[PDB]
Amino acid sequence: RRAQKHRLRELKIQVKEFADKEEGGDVKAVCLTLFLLALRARNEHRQADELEAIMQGRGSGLQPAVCLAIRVNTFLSCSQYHKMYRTVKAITGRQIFQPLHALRNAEKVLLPGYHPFEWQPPLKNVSSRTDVGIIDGLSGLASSVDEYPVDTIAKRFRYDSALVSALMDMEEDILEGMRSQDLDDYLNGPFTVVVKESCDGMGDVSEKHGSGPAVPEKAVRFSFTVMRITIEHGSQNVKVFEEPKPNSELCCKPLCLMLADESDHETLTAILSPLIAEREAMKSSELTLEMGGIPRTFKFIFRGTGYDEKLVREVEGLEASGSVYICTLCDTTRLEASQNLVFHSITRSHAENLQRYEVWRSNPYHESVEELRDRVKGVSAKPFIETVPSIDALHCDIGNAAEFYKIFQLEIGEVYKHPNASKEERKRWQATLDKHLRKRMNLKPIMRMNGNFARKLMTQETVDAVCELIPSEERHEALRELMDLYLKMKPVWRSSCPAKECPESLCQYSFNSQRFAELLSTKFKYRYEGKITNYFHKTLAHVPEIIERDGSIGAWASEGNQSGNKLFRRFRKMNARQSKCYEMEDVLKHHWLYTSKYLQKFMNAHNA
Amino acid sequence: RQHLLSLTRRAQKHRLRELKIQVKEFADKEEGGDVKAVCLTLFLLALRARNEHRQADELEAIMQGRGSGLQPAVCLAIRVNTFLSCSQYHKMYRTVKAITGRQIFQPLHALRNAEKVLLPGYHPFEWQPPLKNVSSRTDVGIIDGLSGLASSVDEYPVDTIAKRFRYDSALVSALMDMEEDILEGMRSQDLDDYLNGPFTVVVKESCDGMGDVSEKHGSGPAVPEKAVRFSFTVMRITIEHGSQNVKVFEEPKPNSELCCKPLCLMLADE
């Protein structure tokens, strides 16, 4: 104390004089600054940063929301977290992670069913309460032995109680947009939300915990997404909010989930009917809800697009994918689209589909089945989901990839010269192709193609390698030029907002696709004279119109929900109470918390 | 001039560099070329002279002492006892740092360079008399279990995998992971810590097969492959002080789940 004080009291009082005469005498500021500088000079800035923090007066503790973000976005348990918490608190004295109870109390403020909200007019058939959490998905389905045996499990939210929370977590992110777009913050116009709906079975979720094989089980998740929030200020509308990366796995929120085969039609309808009830109810009403102080009014638009091919083929009520009728958007038989190549439109809506099923069931013309089926263009069931039609992206690209992979395997045998080989030359061709590719481009052998493989194989390098394997020469043009046409075509739908990103390939798509068409019809007509596959009709005839109809083609895809599948399994065996009736409550709740935005706003701290 | 805190990065640097230079050269010729240490001392005095012992005490803690932040060993301990991955730990660390300003957890490389002190083959040791048929180096970590088994198409076909520590290096690491416990023991037993009597260790060894540890990959069946793990346990350390042996360390929970240390493991059958 006095020891060091008198050890250099000379220089102490001297620097006091100097700080008074020049720096005025803010001894605190100058002394601290010179110590931080003398410490930084020698590159030990850890102490510099922590000391600046402790002098600035920032508590080391964390708001419960942050530690919750950590626990949910790092897949910790509810006891491992306790381990970490108690060890940190014991080591460094002051607690840095909040306890568990204070984590749950801040968990509740984000799960759905916590805020007041009122509809105008009140939704018919929808309850008025505002405190509904995780509702049993079965919807009070009477299950007694005298009735139909039903055994699946299902959990869900309501639909309004989920939209409310999805909006009130992004309150700040919509207000910031309102500011950035030069708008008076205190505005309560009729906001309009755009919500993309999706669904896709993700079977083979079980585990042979008993080491006994041959026991499968499937599951289904019905989930939605907010994609654009728009207000009509003055004369026109403005994009108060838009989604950065729509078809990813962190911005698609689950709404219900169940353990039932995606084709078990009866159970599927029995569980998914209430959702469509609520969805049709809240399509002609307004939701009043305070949004950062003053109240605001919301209205919605629901586009159902994230449906693969099999679902949209089944629930919308068409004959299965092996039909003579191919396009879910127009009514043409493969043996007709293969001839009239690209001049179609979209003429298969949902209400048309429904009245067509009606004219099927009633059969007013007293005509036989074989021509009635043709009259009703292949509708044979009652559709129960209003879904907009549009090409998927992920599965379309994978299909095209496997498609021209098979054409490569075909061109090995050069069957155009000698046709009609048997199914052993074919296996030999496949083996030769796979070995040559593994030797040249090191493309591993795989049976079920993955998007990574699909991107790996659509390259000029690999087509040149196979072109150097194959004997003849005309095949060189007839394959390399086809492949470069395909690559010139792909981005206008692979993109996420190609309305302006690649606004040249779009305007050239007409030529870029009709040349593909003509050459497939001329130099390859030895395969495409009759049967043409479906996706090679979709990409050919519809996308240059679906773009102008909707906008993106990538953003309206199911890549997001699909990517989520993995997460399921993880949560299932790191967060579950082992009751087959809470094993879905917990999974749904954790998936909800994960897919929030008010949480990821913390995990993106280091950037900003 | 406005305030050294309101200015930009080196704004204050140029503003006060005059006084900085004069008194820093005076002080480095005073105490032989050192400014940061005496500068923090005078900072301590000139600040806590305004009745603010709090920040001075926490500063004395954080500098040349523990307190805030975590020793790399601690963060390693929690990372391995909570079965966290690597990228997960990175996420937690970076977001904690970005939020609370300070740096509580340590980075990754500063964790590898701090786990390299607990695996075998880091310490120096000397056998005497030397060990027949045993190498003498002290840099033997993981080594292949097959021990250089000729595996070509002309000899007995082998298709197993095995990894192991050398016995001596693993054993010396077991000893240098309980130095503190044996010291506390001989202290409590009223001995002298400056003692290097010939301690006698008593070890326990075990080997039990753990068959059926495969799992289905992708979406399909699995194959019944077994596995074997050879492991030991330090169990009782003693020393013969004076005329009789005195017990210096015993295991609290002998057959516990976390005091049998692995030594070798293989994907074979028993």
Ligand SMILES: [Ca+2]
């Ligand atoms: Ca599917």
Ligand SMILES: [Ca+2]
């Ligand atoms: Ca899928």
Ligand SMILES: [Ca+2]
């Ligand atoms: Ca056993």
Ligand SMILES: [Ca+2]
């Ligand atoms: Ca055994």
Ligand SMILES: [Zn+2]
């Ligand atoms: Zn069509």
